[PDB]
Symmetry: D3
Subunit: 155 residues, 6 copies
């Protein structure tokens, strides 16, 4: 009964996030995607959850839930003690290392990092929204469903 939580704001989820989800789902019996409401973004929590569920239909051991407060409480209240997160740069690692060691200290929750797929090294939710806002084509970087939903928000 292994399991991990994949956290983030996912505003919106990108193909980089989805690649991490599929990789976590392939190595752990249970995966929970934690959509963290940070109470100002583009999509509502429900819409963000919707887009992830649509894009993770092929992953039977994955579910999607919203959460508030400490991530470690979200993890431990579901019987787990591992977090899985994607990393692009050494700079990412240093910032995330601080939070990973804090989370282990306060609650015994482990963090496992996975290297980004090379093709998505440059995609982030914020850069994809910025480029799309000014008319650039980001369709190769986002799940097909998400892309249409993003156009709607702009138009």
């Amino acid at each position: 009964m292994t399991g991990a939580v994949c956290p983030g704001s996912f505003d919106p989820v990108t193909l980089g996030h989805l690649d991490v989800f599929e990789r976590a789902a392939a190595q752990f019996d249970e995966v929970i995607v934690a959509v963290l409401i940070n109470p100002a973004g583009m999509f509502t929590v429900d819409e963000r959850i919707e887009m992830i569920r649509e894009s993770t239909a092929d992953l039977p051991n994955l579910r999607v839930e919203s959460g508030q407060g400490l991530l470690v409480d979200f993890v431990r209240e579901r019987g787990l003690n591992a977090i899985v997160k994607g990393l692009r740069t050494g700079t990412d690692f240093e910032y995330e290392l601080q939070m990973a060691q804090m989370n282990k200290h306060i609650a015994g929750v482990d963090t496992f990092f996975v290297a980004t797929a090379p093709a998505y090294s440059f995609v982030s939710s914020s850069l994809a929204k910025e480029v799309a806002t000014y008319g650039g084509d980001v369709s190769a970087l986002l799940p097909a469903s998400v892309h249409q939903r993003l156009l709607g928000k702009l138009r």
Copy 2:
């Protein structure tokens, strides 16, 4: 039936390695420590395997084996496709990211990185051997068994 391989030269295994072993063993049903013979070190492969087995007696789902050649062949010939490795710095991440993406490309094997425990951020097999060689006390950095075995090699 989840599982991961923890690779390295482990010449000798340190408390930093052992911390990664225990963390991998807590999140995967099966863990194999792969002692990679790089065919010049201090300990023989058999001695390195011995010291790890002695220090991992409390971990029932972990075993220790030697290997040669491509790590991904070692992993896949045992039915697994995940590697777990410890990281200390962003610099570590960048070097290891290259190998992780290569390994995923050539064989579909995933790599999960874990942040070092803060207390062991500065310990490496090479620095521990260097300091011990010149008379410094490294007993707080190595498993009790390993420490005695290292003194023997020097004296």
Copy 3:
């Protein structure tokens, strides 16, 4: 035939920027300095002030011109028939961030980015830090062209 765009907010231009301009102008037939304005946040200097400070300190570069713009940099570049951006970089940290944007710009528009290492003497000057130091009275005259220094002190007073 060859050409490159050197973008930034240049609020204000520094000696580190001018070094990049000179090195680009030496290696490309034409260089356009692109003063990118955020229509939603005013900086310290207006667009015309930024352009005049750059023009005054690049008068000896005959193949360089200065133009403002907004929106996607790649559109500014391609509308001028060009395909290359030249940017200065100070650290490995600079490189990871700028690498994200350079790969995105290549992905969406085919525009290449060439990075150049800062001159050592300017490794530590940035528009933001020079403004912050000047605000509290520190002497930054050796980090900014003559075209900028006293205009900066005037803005602060």
Copy 4:
């Protein structure tokens, strides 16, 4: 008479900060901890509360004293007859941004900066992260001086 200034916001002081203070006080004849007041961003503790928390945790350091400061740090340093800053560093990116500021401070005023590596146990503690964790009920008692923790629980109630 050697000496150095240890600057920061210390809102609140952490055991990481205290480790730096102790190491500085062991190597310089005099150390001044400079509690940097920011007229804009007012955090969780008042300046006087921050000073009293540092004084409580540094009671065994007779050559260290604590004062509030405002404006340009190199003026604070040089107005006290000193010309060195001591700061703790956790990571390589810590070094990058701090390196720019140190080179700037050396250029504008001749003040030098000495960096010390964090004790391993505190590499992950910061004032901001400790406050955030504590706000949602996490136990950060092992990361802060004994007295800070009680004062921090009171501010949250």
Copy 5:
């Protein structure tokens, strides 16, 4: 007439290198690929084999030519009437060591260096890692030009 030199050992050339060559040839009137011979470390392919592999993979680049070089790179560059180097970068630590060399080359000879970010697909390929993987039977065909791969299988038999 603008131009740049693309240096390396290219033992063997990878698709990452070729991407850099193509981007340099698109932006400079002339590009010279400099295959750096090292009298000490002789790798897997002879200099002439390396040159022929690069020429095969760059057949569609008419303004790029390939030559061997020895000794100080800035002499090679300046003996050909050029004063720019173009190199690909993968990571922030790539930038660090390369930044030192670029500043040194600018200081000692006035030669500038322009860095281009790797195409994302090749961020993990290097000559050394491709050789090592291939030596133990791994399939690196998608990371090398078609012709290199055949030649590489022959050297391993």
Copy 6:
């Protein structure tokens, strides 16, 4: 009373090292430059040559002395009644590596390490790169003290 050790192989000393020496000598009552010799690998300069090159370029620093040693740096430090090492750092990459050794040195012997940011003008000089450039005939006279340059060219010829 206060004191610090500045260690290195200094083969040979550079202007970047001398800058660190001067900054340490300004902040500590005494400074010892520790020339650490590897008895198993000769460098370019003998131990006596390294010491004389340092002494000749530090003659204006009355509180600095130069001594060689081998083995554990912390033993050199503590045998002189001191507890502090001062080292220059150029990058975040420098910092991660040196942080490992500094934390180990603190762990095994209680010795503190203070790092100082390189002067910008010397960010790119290292003993190894200056030797490599000089070997192939590049001009490094502005990166080394007078005490070194011609002795270096003599070694190479």
